[PDB]
């Protein structure tokens, strides 16, 4: 695993020693090379795992997330190239350093053979993201947003640490292999109930769960484009990865401890999908759509069936890609309008046809159009929930309909209609933006050819 960690570390001295007008080229090229190297991890095996050493190991749940994390950085660099043009060389190097540190922390988090190291890196990811949100944020609310994005997370995970060490005082180890092989049931007791709560609430808050999601619209709206990319695409999947890793010791208590969370997620998907219908902001709409998709993933994880896990993994990957592309499109519109309001900019297919095509494809992918991996995860989770209970489909069905609605609404209000007359600063889309859109959308349609690469270890 060091063959990928070491180049990510070496990205920092290369950036800090580069010329004042050549940092972006070097960063993008070497990030793409690192992603190409990390593509090797996709060759998983039906056997146990790729146990590299005592500290790092790779599974078919960790491999797609690692590949997505490595692939995200070049896209974030291309997205941030624009609004950091008038920025001093030292501050641009600091921004690239923060991005590289975040990628390194995520890469070390996704392997994380030991659970305490996983938690330490899980919380280490919080610092560069907070710095990015609070420093390079345009609006005045960013600071408050950052505060939220911090405290919620910590409020979730401070008990977890205690629980973690408590386990090592009883079980004696926190290595995931030993934990899996020496698993023992949790008796129905109040102490076990609170241990379950401490283990679960840590990852519930960052997913986020409905009722604990108030930090997410603030963090995504107030953050710069790269921050929105990293939060929507990868940083949301940390909770799901942690839950799928840690639910191996919570049985059979979960069989009755998942009812409040299942109810909360199955109603919050509807609530957030309806919230998306009436939104005056594009970024808030995308954030609430992300909340709905993550609530569906939470339902899948709480069901705890093989089809649930497969659908959860596929949906996480597809949602990360789709949300990243949607945030990029919204930022491209904002950089010309400088308002971030849906109804101010209208009739854009007359002026930017290729951007309208990109918007259509992104909306269709969000709308879960077959045979995309989005719908693969959707159908897997839906069938698993139907097996769990034949009534859930009703709620699920409603969500699907509502989803499509707001998606096309986002497509119709911004692209269709008559253009705004008093906006004459709509320049033709650059090659950079179109290349970013293509690099976002082509991997989705290529992954739909080989779904088993993102279906997880239970395929």
């Amino acid at each position: 695993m060091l063959k990928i960690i070491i180049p990510t570390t070496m990205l920092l001295p290369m950036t800090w020693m580069s010329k004042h007008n050549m940092i972006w080229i070097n960063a993008t090229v070497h990030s793409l090379l690192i992603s190409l190297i990390s593509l090797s991890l996709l060759n998983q095996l039906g056997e146990n795992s790729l146990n590299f050493s005592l500290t790092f190991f790779s599974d078919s749940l960790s491999a797609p997330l690692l590949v997505l994390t490595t692939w995200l950085l070049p896209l974030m660099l291309m997205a941030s190239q624009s609004h950091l043009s008038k920025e001093t060389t030292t501050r641009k190097k600091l921004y690239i350093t923060m991005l590289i540190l975040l990628q390194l922390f995520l890469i070390m988090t996704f392997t994380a053979t030991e659970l305490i190291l996983f938690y330490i890196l899980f919380e280490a990811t919080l610092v560069p993201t907070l710095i990015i949100i609070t420093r390079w944020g345009n609006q005045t609310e960013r600071l408050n947003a950052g505060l939220y994005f911090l405290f919620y997370t910590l409020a979730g995970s401070l008990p977890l640490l205690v629980a973690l060490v408590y386990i090592q005082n009883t079980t004696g180890s926190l290595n995931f292999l030993i934990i899996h092989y020496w698993s023992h049931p949790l008796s129905n007791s109040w102490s076990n109930i609170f241990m379950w709560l401490a283990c679960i609430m840590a990852f519930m808050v960052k997913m986020p769960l409905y009722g604990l999601h108030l930090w997410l619209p603030k963090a995504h709206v107030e953050a710069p484009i790269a921050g929105s990319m990293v939060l929507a695409a990868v940083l949301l999947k940390l909770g799901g990865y942690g839950m799928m890793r840690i639910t191996t010791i919570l049985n059979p208590l979960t069989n009755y401890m998942a009812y409040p969370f299942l109810m909360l997620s199955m109603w919050g998907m509807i609530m957030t999908s309806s919230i998306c219908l009436r939104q005056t902001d594009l970024k808030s709409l995308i954030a609430y759509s992300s909340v709905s998709h993550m609530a569906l993933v939470i339902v899948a994880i709480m069901i705890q069936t093989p089809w649930s896990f497969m659908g959860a993994t596929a949906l996480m990957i597809a949602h990360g890609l789709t949300s990243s592309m949607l945030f990029c499109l919204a930022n491209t519109n904002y950089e010309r309008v400088h308002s971030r309001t849906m109804i101010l900019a209208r009739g854009l297919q007359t002026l930017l046809p290729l951007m309208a095509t990109w918007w259509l494809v992104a909306s269709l992918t969000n709308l879960a159009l077959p045979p995309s991996i989005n719908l693969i995860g959707e159908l897997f989770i839906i069938t698993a929930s139907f097996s769990w209970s034949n009534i859930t489909i009703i709620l699920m069905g409603m969500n699907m309909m509502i989803t499509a609605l707001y998606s096309l609404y986002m497509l119709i209000t911004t692209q269709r209609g008559k253009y705004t007359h008093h906006i004459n600063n709509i320049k033709p889309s650059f090659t950079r933006e179109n290349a970013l859109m293509a690099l976002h959308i082509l991997p989705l349609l290529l992954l739909t050819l080989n779904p088993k690469m993102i279906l997880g270890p239970l395929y």
Partner: protein, 156 residues
Amino acid sequence: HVTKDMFPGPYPKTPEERAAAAKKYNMRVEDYEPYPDDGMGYGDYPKLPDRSQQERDPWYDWDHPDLRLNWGEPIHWDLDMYIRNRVDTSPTPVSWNTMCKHLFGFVAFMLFMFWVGEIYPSYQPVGPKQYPYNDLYLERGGDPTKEPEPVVHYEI
């Protein structure tokens, strides 16, 4: 480029601040009416008639012809609900109550008559169709190791 004073504020409870709020939203003082001071935070923002924007004048030269909107005029709170692509409150040739009664009466009558016809079906003065080989036992389900009771058909 917008001043702090311009933005929405608390509920206007005195006539002078009511007039100031009315002037802020670019409307007449006696034409301005805030939402009732309940728990919901409507506050300073004015209450405009619930009329849809589909029924606005289509021949006036609006600054936003698609939305039928003007530059500067106070936007309705639920503007995004009334955008000519959604619910519209345009008057109908027939009163709403009468349309509701006619629609639900027609639907209920159709359902009741369908149920009645289900009670009293329509058929032909014939007996059931006869199938030769033990009511097609072998070809419908199979199970050839039971030898069911033979059925013979009465030739007339």
